[PDB]
Amino acid sequence: ELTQSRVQKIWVPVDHNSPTVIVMVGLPARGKTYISKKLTRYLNWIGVPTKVFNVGEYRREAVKQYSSYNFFRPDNEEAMKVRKQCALAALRDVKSYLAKEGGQIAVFDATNTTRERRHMILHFAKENDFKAFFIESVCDDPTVVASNIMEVKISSPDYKDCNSAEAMDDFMKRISCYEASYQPLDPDKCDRDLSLIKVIDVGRRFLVNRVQDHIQSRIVYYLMNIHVQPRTIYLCRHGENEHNLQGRIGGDSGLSSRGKKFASALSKFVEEQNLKDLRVWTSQLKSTIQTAEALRLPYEQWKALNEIDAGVCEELTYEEIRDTYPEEYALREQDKYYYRYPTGESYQDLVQRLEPVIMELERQENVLVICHQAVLRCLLAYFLDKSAEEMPYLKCPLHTVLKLTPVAYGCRVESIYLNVESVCTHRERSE
């Protein structure tokens, strides 16, 4: 016999591959940490457990505050010993994360600019049975380097007792400390056997060598879709709909009278925002489409943006679900991310179908996504680096636009309520 597990609905028989170390490579202020973080955010959200080990954070913990670039001098015998021990301590943690804590990918975020340092990470990987994948960021444009420094270096803890001008100055010399011994990845000759991507001039061009597995090709694909241009992402739900007024889930009802006032308000908001080339996306459910109709803009529908499928519970109230399917109600409340409605979906299923939405979102600039409660949560979690456990409980009120702006290494979210009443469909984590 086979039995169907209670939360996920997976048929199982009755009782009766290598982790990867991703090695960042490059001079300081080349976006290594920007990429480390963003990538880790994508990987975790698609369900590959990933963690960043930034050697700089180890050095900052092992050493009294930073005073100047002299700490990074190649003739600094003692700082060198410290730096090397910081790398080894980060690797100890990498071993722990991947071999014992269920980690899948560890991103070793450091300059790792010498063949020697990289050879040692390889030895580490090889003897723990970890795959190694290198990502190098190369850029010689001073404008880009300057910008990076202004944007994330001068505000860092290292420079808290320095003004801008002198953080910038210190950082420039800090970089020059690494230049003499920098051996770029060389896939033609000495690195022909390594798996790596060398990125040149901020994603303009890539060198890819020996992709070993699906995580690696997928990272390359991700890296070819992202960009660093400023832009804005607006996320909202459909205007209130008739099923909302009844506390009924799922279905494909139309906008209520308030829902229509929202749409009209949303149109005003969008106009006042004054964007160029704002793309608009909806699901294929009517609520969403009517809402976009009020904007008088071109929009495109995506079945992927359709609300979670409640299967056999579609169109019931939560009340009716507790009465009719008491046991299914409880299972969901106890594990709301992995719980699969019977005949239906989990939040986990949602991530899989939203993955192509995220990938296209990364390619776009200004976008307005009009969608549904659970879908919105799933997208929002991606942008705000929220865990699978939290995602089902993020708050996405009706008639409220969430305005997301890339800033520094992450994302500012700004809530904008359009002053139209609605019922509340938020349901707290109960225990």
Ligand X SMILES: Cn1ccc2ccc(-c3cc(Nc4cnccc4C(=O)NC4CCOCC4)cc4nccnc34)cc21
Active site residues: 109, 139, 238, 307
Applying the rule CB under 6 A, the residues between 74 and 93 that interact with ligand F6P are: none
Q: Exactly one of 87, 121, 249, 354 binds ligand F6P (CB under 6 A); which one?
A: 249
Q: Does 373 bind ligand F6P (CB under 6 A)?
A: yes
| Residue 310 sits in the site that holds ligand F6P (CB under 6 A) | yes
Count of residues in contact with ligand F6P, rule CB under 6 A: 11
DSSP annotation of 422 reads: -
| Cα dihedral 346/352/354/355 (nearest 10) | 150
370 is a contact residue toward ligand F6P (CB under 6 A): no
20 or 291: CB nearest ligand X: 20
DSSP output for 53-116: EEHHHHHHHHSS----GGGG-TT-HHHHHHHHHHHHHHHHHHHHHHHHS---EEEEES---SHH
Query: Is 331 marked as binding a ligand?
Result: yes
Which residues does a gap of C–N over 2.5 Å follow in the chain? 16
Min separation Cβ 216 and ligand X, Å: 14
At 323, list the tokens. Answer: 């009465």
Burial class (CB in 10 A: 0-12, 13-18, 19+), 165: exposed
State yes or no: residue 380 binds ligand F6P (CB under 6 A). Answer: no
Least distance in Å: CB of 246 to ligand F6P? 10
| 409 is known to lie in a ligand binding site | yes
CA–CA–CA angle 279, 356, 212 (5° rounding)? 140
H-state helical runs in 364-419:
373-384
The yes or no reply on residue 94 touching ligand X (CB under 6 A) is no
Tell me: is residue 149 an annotated ligand-binding position.
Answer: yes
Where is 138: in which H helix or E strand?
A: strand 131-138
In the set 48, 80, 89, 152, which binds ligand X (CB under 6 A)?
152
State yes or no: 418 annotated in a binding site.
no
Among 227, 426, 427, 429, binds ligand X (CB under 6 A): 227
Distances (CA, A) of 166 to 66, 67, 153, 163: 13, 11, 12, 6
- Residues near ligand X (CB under 6 A) are 30-31, 34-35, 137, 139, 144, 148, 151-152, 199, 202-203, 223, 226-228, 230, 406
- Residues near ligand F6P (CB under 6 A) are 249-250, 307-308, 310, 372-374, 392, 425, 427
